[PDB]
Amino acid sequence: GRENLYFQGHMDRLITLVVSYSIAFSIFALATMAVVYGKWLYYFEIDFLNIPDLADMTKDEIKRNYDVLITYLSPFYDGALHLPTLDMSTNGRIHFVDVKNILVKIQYVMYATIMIAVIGGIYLLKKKNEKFLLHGSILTIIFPIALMLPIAINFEKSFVLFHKLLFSNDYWVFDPEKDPIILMLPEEFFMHAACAILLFILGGSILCYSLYRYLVKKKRMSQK
Ligand SMILES: CCCCCCCC/C=C\CCCCCCCC(=O)OC[C@H](O)CO
Ligand SMILES: CCCCCCCC/C=C\CCCCCCCC(=O)OC[C@H](O)CO
Ligand SMILES: CCCCCCCC/C=C\CCCCCCCC(=O)OC[C@H](O)CO
Ligand SMILES: CCCCCCCC/C=C\CCCCCCCC(=O)OC[C@H](O)CO
Ligand SMILES: CCCCCCCC/C=C\CCCCCCCC(=O)OC[C@H](O)CO
């Protein structure tokens, strides 16, 4: 009676897979947005990395320019980028537009994946299937560990290839005399920022496994 069973139960396995990656991407996307728009890390870094001596600016000047930049990167802001006290080139202006376009598009996919995760997740949970949580947690821990290595071994070369991968021009190659903002965006900050994203993704993996372990515990205790 098993002979007709090779062709069976394909649909729900697909939904779990789609939901698994949507949760994965959603966590990655939320982690990125948390770091890009959260000013606590950079505010800490101004003093810790001594950015005032790197940039030859005061602590409030650095915050003023950084605030204007982060506001510009918001999807709800439609004006152009105009730094309060720093010079900027045409190509530099074009680079920050590219950055904003990346952030907007990631947010758009993120909205789709969050709704696939929620709707697909309610469907599977109402089937008493909490497996998308396990698979989702697996993807969220493999991804940061896999990228930990290029950050640790050679962060600087990873930075250049990351840029060569995401951007289609060389405008990301800032000249401090034409785009002085680069002085107050030191590479060590980007490394802390990159490490911050992975930690949030890692934290997301913990939260998913923990909810998976809770639901499994409920069914086995439901037996008892
Ligand atoms: C189970 C999945 C868990 C997902 C959690 C993975 C880690 C992501 C961290 C935070 C996400 C929620 C925080 C809100 C996300 C957007 C943050 C933001 O927009 O920053 C605004 C800024 O604080 C204004 O100054
Ligand atoms: C339509 C259905 C959607 C359902 C799913 C929605 C869940 C939203 C979760 C996080 C929002 C993250 C959005 C990131 C936008 C950040 C904007 C921002 O924080 O602006 C900061 C400002 O620039 C500082 O001055
Ligand atoms: C239509 C859907 C097409 C898009 C498909 C999904 C989007 C994933 C793309 C890139 C992920 C990389 C995430 C990196 C987010 C931050 C990168 C960044 O902004 O770089 C800053 C740098 O300092 C500037 O020079
Ligand atoms: C203090 C330095 C911080 C860096 C280290 C932070 C901890 C790493 C996060 C999770 C590891 C495992 C703990 C919880 C398990 C969740 C990860 C997971 O999804 O593992 C699934 C596994 O396959 C099912 O056995
Ligand atoms: C190791 C390869 C990946 C390394 C990259 C991961 C870190 C980027 C993520 C968040 C940055 C948050 C700060 C956002 C500040 C604006 C980004 C920006 O436009 O920076 C200009 C750039 O430095 C012109 O070269």
Numbering used by the authors: -9 to 214
What does the study report here?
Here, we report the crystal structure of the Lit enzyme from Bacillus cereus and describe its mechanism of action.
Two structures were solved; one at 2.27 Å, the other at 1.95 Å. The protein assumes the shape of a truncated cone that spans the membrane with four transmembrane helices (M1–M4). Notably, two structured monoolein molecules that derive from the crystallisation process reside with their glyceryl head groups coordinated with the two conserved histidines. The sn-3 hydroxyl of MO2 coordinates with His85 and His153. In MolB of the asymmetric unit, the chains run parallel to one another below the apolar surface of amphiphilic H4. In the apo form of Lit, M3 is bent midway along its length between Pro134 and Pro140.
